[PDB]
Amino acid sequence: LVPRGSHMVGLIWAQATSGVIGRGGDIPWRLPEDQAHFREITMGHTIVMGRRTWDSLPAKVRPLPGRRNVVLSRQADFMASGAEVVGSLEEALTSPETWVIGGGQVYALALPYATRCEVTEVDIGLPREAGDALAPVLDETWRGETGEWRFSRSGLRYRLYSYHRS
Ligand SMILES: NC(=O)c1ccc[n+]([C@@H]2O[C@H](COP(=O)([O-])OP(=O)(O)OC[C@H]3O[C@@H](n4cnc5c(N)ncnc54)[C@H](OP(=O)(O)O)[C@@H]3O)[C@@H](O)[C@H]2O)c1
Ligand SMILES: Cc1nc(N)nc(N)c1OCCCOc1cc(Cl)c(Cl)cc1Cl
Numbered sequence: 001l002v003p004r005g006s007h008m009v010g011l012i013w014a015q016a017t018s019g020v021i022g023r024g025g026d027i028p029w030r031l032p033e034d035q036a037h038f039r040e041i042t043m044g045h046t047i048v049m050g051r052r053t054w055d056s057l058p059a060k061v062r063p064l065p066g067r068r069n070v071v072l073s074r075q076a077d078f079m080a081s082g083a084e085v086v087g088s089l090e091e092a093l094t095s096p097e098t099w100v101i102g103g104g105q106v107y108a109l110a111l112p113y114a115t116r117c118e119v120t121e122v123d124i125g126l127p128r129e130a131g132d133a134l135a136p137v138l139d140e141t142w143r144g145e146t147g148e149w150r151f152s153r154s155g156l157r158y159r160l161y162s163y164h165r166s
Pocket of ligand 1: 025049106
């Protein structure tokens with residue numbers, strides 16, 4: 001689908017219905033089904049994340065295996081074992097296929113160049129709070145399909161959105 005000479009940038013995130021994606025340096029829910037979905041989409045590709053999202057990774061999956069981990073930071077001395085640290089978006093988006101995996105700052109940074117968004121919506125009524133990380137706002141040029149609601153093992157329900165644009 002992707003010509004190897006092109007640079008497909010995709011965004012992937014899970015959000016509460018309110019748009020909350022992050023809180024207190026963590027994701028305020030657990031959804032193994034979403035983790036699986038995220039793994040399915042990003043596997044074998046370059047992934048790009050903000051430094052704070054690197055900090056948020058569970059140790060057992062830091063770095064995320066099977067993927068080239070790229071971390072954006074302005075700290076030249078930042079230690080990110082198993083990952084590479086770059087100081088600019090330009091040097092982070094050199095692969096034919098890149099998935100930007102968070103957080104709020106880097107979604108907003110990469111969004112203008114993105115042509116794919118893979119969104120998990122979790123039906124949890126977490127209101128937006130001060131200091132929360134929020135999902136980026138998509139313009140009208142995006143289009144795609146909304147999947148049906150599904151119960152997770154835990155009884156938490158979620159659904160998948162696949163957006164794209166030219
Ligand atoms: N629900 C989800 O799908 C999901 C996914 C990922 C993350 N999250 C959540 O999102 C939250 C973190 O998001 P966030 O917005 O606070 O932080 P973030 O986007 O993960 O990281 C921001 C950091 O990235 C670096 N950075 C940002 N813009 C840059 C630029 N233009 N050039 C170079 N470096 C740059 C800076 O690092 P330095 O400060 O080191 O310079 C900055 O502090 C956490 O709560 C996390 O759990 C949620
Ligand atoms: C979890 C997730 N889900 C989706 N659909 N997209 C993401 N970017 C995403 O975040 C990837 C970076 C954070 O990765 C994790 C964070 C936590 Cl708190 C846990 Cl328990 C697991 C993972 Cl992989």
